[PDB]
Design an enzyme around this catalytic site. Structure first.
Site, mmCIF file in Angstrom:
data_model
loop_
_atom_site.group_PDB
_atom_site.id
_atom_site.type_symbol
_atom_site.label_atom_id
_atom_site.label_comp_id
_atom_site.label_asym_id
_atom_site.label_seq_id
_atom_site.Cartn_x
_atom_site.Cartn_y
_atom_site.Cartn_z
ATOM 1 N N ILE A 71 -26.565 25.063 11.633
ATOM 2 C CA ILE A 71 -26.749 23.293 11.299
ATOM 3 C C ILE A 71 -27.553 22.913 10.321
ATOM 4 O O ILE A 71 -28.362 23.549 9.638
ATOM 5 C CB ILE A 71 -28.203 23.364 13.050
ATOM 6 C CG1 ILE A 71 -27.785 23.607 14.322
ATOM 7 C CG2 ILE A 71 -28.488 21.261 12.311
ATOM 8 C CD1 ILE A 71 -27.661 24.655 14.607
ATOM 9 N N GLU A 160 -28.002 30.336 19.044
ATOM 10 C CA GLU A 160 -28.131 31.473 19.486
ATOM 11 C C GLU A 160 -27.452 31.771 20.543
ATOM 12 O O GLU A 160 -27.342 32.903 20.718
ATOM 13 C CB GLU A 160 -29.401 31.974 19.189
ATOM 14 C CG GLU A 160 -30.392 31.779 17.065
ATOM 15 C CD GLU A 160 -29.834 33.244 16.444
ATOM 16 O OE1 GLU A 160 -30.602 32.323 14.954
ATOM 17 O OE2 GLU A 160 -28.739 33.170 16.578
ATOM 18 N N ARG A 163 -24.068 32.534 19.777
ATOM 19 C CA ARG A 163 -23.497 34.019 19.182
ATOM 20 C C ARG A 163 -23.642 35.106 20.296
ATOM 21 O O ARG A 163 -22.784 36.106 20.393
ATOM 22 C CB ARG A 163 -24.941 34.325 18.987
ATOM 23 C CG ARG A 163 -23.899 33.436 16.781
ATOM 24 C CD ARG A 163 -25.467 33.424 15.991
ATOM 25 N NE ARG A 163 -24.869 32.551 14.950
ATOM 26 C CZ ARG A 163 -25.852 31.910 14.328
ATOM 27 N NH1 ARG A 163 -27.379 32.302 14.279
ATOM 28 N NH2 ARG A 163 -25.416 30.981 12.852
#
Ligand SMILES: C[n+]1cn([C@@H]2O[C@H](COP(=O)(O)OP(=O)(O)OP(=O)(O)O)[C@@H](O)[C@H]2O)c2nc(N)[nH]c(=O)c21
Ligand SMILES: *[C@@H]1O[C@H](CO)[C@@H](O[C@@H]2O[C@H](CO)[C@@H](O)[C@H](O)[C@H]2NC(C)=O)[C@H](O)[C@H]1NC(C)=O
EC number: 3.2.2.22
Length: 246
Positions: A71, A160, A163
């Site tokens: 970000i 996250e 991912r």
């Protein structure tokens, strides 16, 4: 762009958002069946915009670097806010041009620094969809201390979960009740770059990591990951950070 509305949100529409977010990160290649993020992308194509709406329907736009899912900053009404780091400064050249003013946050985007500004490490900060509503609300009006904690929420519940399928599932579990991240969640977040690197190095080492990565598993136990047959690689990890950026 991708969007996510907290209003009416359930595990299923949060799941749609994380799929849209992954689908918006470009790749030309997969390595052990996992998309390989790009070494670089020039200009404004480098940033994805995520439009996030809290329960009440107020909104921020978050600029995300598509090469590494970092970000960079966000827009809240007429003000842009960027991390205090050269990559973010660079991003500010391309996104949120129209903002009336641009504020530089007094910290970089990393977890250590953010945990310092916030006053608590991640292990103690509940995440979930309600926490993500809170974080949007917080970012709508500048408060650097609050913002650190809100950003720690926002990074985990977006980047996250993009991912790792496990992290995405953790967040779906807290669609209506926040809870501090599991030990595995924190371990996976900490290992993404290490994992991304070993999976790429295995490509000519017969699937064998050059260096085993230590993780905590779903049951809270300390595993050693030594090859690409491991379920962390076959089931969980969804994007690989390009070794050129490591
Ligand atoms: C080096 N760096 C990492 N990140 C991401 O910002 C978050 C916190 O930053 P980090 O550097 O603490 O991440 P971590 O130790 O988890 O490193 P990783 O395994 O390599 O990702 C994580 O999602 C990082 O992936 C970063 N984000 C921003 N905005 N700027 C950065 O320089 C930066
Ligand atoms: C590579 O992949 C798997 C990891 O999932 C390993 O399989 C494990 O191997 C040892 C014995 O070799 C057992 O104690 C583990 O519990 C096994 N796990 C599973 C899920 O099968 C394998 O050994 C690894 N080997 C190498 C050489 O890297």
């Amino acid at each position: 762009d991708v969007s996510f509305r907290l209003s009416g949100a359930d595990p299923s529409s949060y799941g749609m958002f994380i799929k849209d977010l992954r689908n918006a990160l470009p790749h030309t290649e997969k390595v052990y069946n996992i998309p390989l993020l790009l070494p670089s992308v020039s200009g404004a194509g480098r940033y994805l915009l995520m439009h996030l709406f809290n329960y009440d329907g107020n909104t921020i736009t978050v600029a995300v670097d598509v090469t590494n899912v970092y970000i960079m900053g966000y827009l809240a009404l007429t003000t842009s806010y960027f991390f205090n780091e050269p990559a973010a400064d660079l991003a500010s050249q391309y996104v949120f041009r129209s903002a009336r003013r641009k504020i530089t946050l007094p910290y970089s985007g990393n977890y250590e620094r953010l945990q310092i500004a916030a006053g608590k490490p991640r292990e103690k900060i509940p995440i979930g969809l309600p926490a993500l509503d809170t974080a949007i609300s917080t970012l709508l009006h500048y408060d650097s201390t609050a913002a650190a904690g809100a950003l720690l929420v926002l990074i985990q519940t977006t980047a996250e979960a993009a991912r790792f399928k496990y992290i995405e599932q953790q967040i779906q579990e807290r669609a209506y009740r926040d809870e501090v991240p599991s030990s595995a969640t924190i371990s996976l977040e900490n290992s993404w770059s290490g994992l991304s690197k070993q999976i790429q190095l295995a490509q000519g080492n017969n699937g064998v990591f050059r260096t085993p990565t230590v993780l905590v598993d779903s049951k809270g136990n300390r595993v050693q990951i030594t090859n690409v047959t491991s379920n962390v690689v076959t089931s969980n990890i969804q994007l690989l950070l390009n070794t050129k950026n490591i």
